[PDB]
Design a protein around this ligand. Structure first.
Ligand SMILES: *[C@@H]1O[C@H](CO)[C@@H](O)[C@H](O)[C@H]1NC(C)=O
Ligand SMILES: *[C@@H]1O[C@H](CO)[C@@H](O)[C@H](O)[C@H]1NC(C)=O
Ligand SMILES: *[C@@H]1O[C@H](CO)[C@@H](O)[C@H](O)[C@H]1NC(C)=O
Ligand SMILES: *[C@@H]1O[C@H](CO)[C@@H](O)[C@H](O)[C@H]1NC(C)=O
Lengths: 20, 48, 96, 58, 91, 48
C-alpha cells in the first residue's frame, strides 16, 4: 500500500473526504 | 481559471479597468459581456 | 397638461419644480401632434404606446436650459448643466 | 558573407518573474537557425521590424 | 504615495498593479529588472515595491463557506456552525 | 417555471409588457434578451 501511495484561489475550494 | 482573463468582446478583462475609464451608463454594456462569458464557462465546467 | 405646457413663467434648471399629477385622464394626441415641439423623444415606453398604457403615478418637471445643451437632458451623458443641476436615472421610464 | 545563428536573440519580453515553469509567448523574435548577414572591417541597412546585432572584439 | 502595512487584508496599488489581499515578506529573489511575479494560471503572487526594493508575497484574504449543523428543528433549536477551511483566529 | 420572471437585462419580465413598453424597433432589442435567457434556461433543464 506504500508503493501505491508513492507512485500516484478565487471562489474555488476543495472539500476533504469524510474517510481519511 | 484561465478563462478569467478573456475579454469575450470587451475593452479589458478587469472590472477595475471598466469601472475606471467608463461612466456607469457605458460600463454596464461592457460588464454584461464579461458576465455572459464567465457564466458560460462556469456552466460548461459544471456539465462536464 | 394644458396649463403646465402653457404656464407663463418657467423656473430655471436648478430650481426645477414637480407638478404632483394623479387621478385624471391623459390624452397625448394633441401633445404628440401639436406640430410645434422641436424635440419630442423618450425611452422605456414607445411614443405610440402611452396613449392607452395606464400608469400608477406620474410626475411632471419643467425648467429652462440653453439651446444646444438640450441633448444633455437624457440618461448617460455629461454636460455642465446635466452635471450639477439635473440628471435622470438610467432606468428612466418617462418622456422628455 | 552569410552565417547561421543557432539559438540566438532571445530576450525577456516583460518584467514578470517566473519560477520553474514553461511559458508560451507570441512576439517579435529572431527565428532559430536564420540567415544573418556578415560584415567585416559600413553601409546603410534597413530596419523594417526590429534588429538583432552582435559584435566581437577586445 | 503612502506607507505600507503588512499582515492585513488591504487594497494595494503598486504602480498600477491593483488588487486586494494580505502582504507578507518573502524568500524570493527577482532579477534586477523584474518588477512582479506570477504563478501558473497567471495570478500575481508577488510584487516589488518601488521604494524599498523589497519583494513581498501576496496572499488572498481568507474566505470560505458557512454551514450550520442542526440536530433537527423537531428536536431542538440549538445549532453549531462550521467555517470551512478557516483558521479559528479569524472569526 | 421560476426563471420565467427574470428580465435578463430587459425592461420588463412580461413580454406583454415588453410589447407594451418598447415596440418593434426597440422590441427587436428587448424581446431578444428574453429569448436569449429563456432558451438557455430550457437547454439547462433538458441537459440535466
Ligand atoms: C395652449 O396654448 C395654445 C395656443 O393658443 C392653445 O392652442 C392650446 O389649446 C393651449 N393648451 C394646450 C393644452 O396646449
Ligand atoms: C541566405 O540567403 C542568400 C540569398 O541568396 C543565399 O544565397 C544564402 O545561401 C543563404 N544562406 C543560408 C545559410 O541559407
Ligand atoms: C416530530 O414532531 C412530531 C410532533 O411533536 C412528533 O409526532 C414526531 O414523533 C417527531 N418526529 C420525530 C421525533 O422523529
Ligand atoms: C492557525 O493559526 C495558529 C495561530 O498562528 C497557528 O499556530 C496554526 O498553525 C494555524 N493552523 C492550525 C491548523 O491551527
Amino acid at each position: 500500500e506504500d508503493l501505491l501511495f508513492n507512485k500516484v484561489f478565487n471562489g474555488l475550494t476543495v472539500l476533504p473526504p469524510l474517510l481519511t | 481559471v484561465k478563462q478569467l482573463s478573456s475579454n469575450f468582446g470587451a475593452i479589458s478583462s478587469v472590472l477595475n479597468d471598466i469601472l475606471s475609464r467608463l461612466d456607469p451608463p457605458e460600463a454596464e454594456v461592457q460588464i454584461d459581456r464579461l458576465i455572459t462569458g464567465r457564466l458560460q464557462s462556469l456552466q460548461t465546467y459544471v456539465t462536464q | 397638461f394644458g396649463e403646465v405646457f402653457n404656464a407663463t413663467r418657467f423656473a430655471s434648471v436648478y430650481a426645477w419644480n414637480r407638478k404632483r399629477i394623479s387621478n385624471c385622464v391623459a390624452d397625448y394626441s394633441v401633445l404628440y401632434n401639436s406640430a410645434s415641439f422641436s424635440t419630442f423623444k423618450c425611452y422605456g415606453v414607445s411614443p405610440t404606446k402611452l396613449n392607452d398604457l395606464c400608469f400608477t403615478n406620474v410626475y411632471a418637471d419643467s425648467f429652462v436650459i440653453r439651446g444646444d445643451e438640450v441633448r444633455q437632458i437624457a440618461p448617460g451623458q455629461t454636460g455642465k448643466i446635466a452635471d450639477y443641476n439635473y440628471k435622470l436615472p438610467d432606468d428612466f421610464t418617462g418622456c422628455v | 558573407a552569410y552565417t547561421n545563428s543557432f539559438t540566438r536573440g532571445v530576450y525577456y519580453p516583460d518584467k514578470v518573474f517566473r519560477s520553474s515553469v514553461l511559458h508560451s509567448t507570441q512576439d517579435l523574435f529572431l527565428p532559430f537557425f536564420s540567415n544573418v548577414t556578415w560584415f567585416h572591417a559600413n553601409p546603410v541597412l534597413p530596419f523594417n521590424d526590429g534588429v538583432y546585432f552582435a559584435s566581437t572584439e577586445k | 504615495s503612502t506607507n505600507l502595512v503588512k499582515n492585513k487584508c488591504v487594497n494595494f496599488n503598486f504602480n498600477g498593479l491593483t488588487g486586494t489581499g494580505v502582504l507578507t515578506e518573502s524568500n524570493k529573489k527577482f532579477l534586477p529588472f523584474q518588477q512582479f511575479g506570477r504563478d501558473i494560471a497567471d495570478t500575481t503572487d508577488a510584487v516589488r515595491d518601488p521604494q524599498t526594493l523589497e519583494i513581498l508575497d501576496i496572499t488572498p484574504c481568507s474566505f470560505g463557506g458557512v454551514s450550520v449543523i442542526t440536530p433537527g428543528t423537531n428536536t431542538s433549536n440549538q445549532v453549531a456552525v462550521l467555517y470551512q477551511d478557516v483558521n479559528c483566529t479569524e472569526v
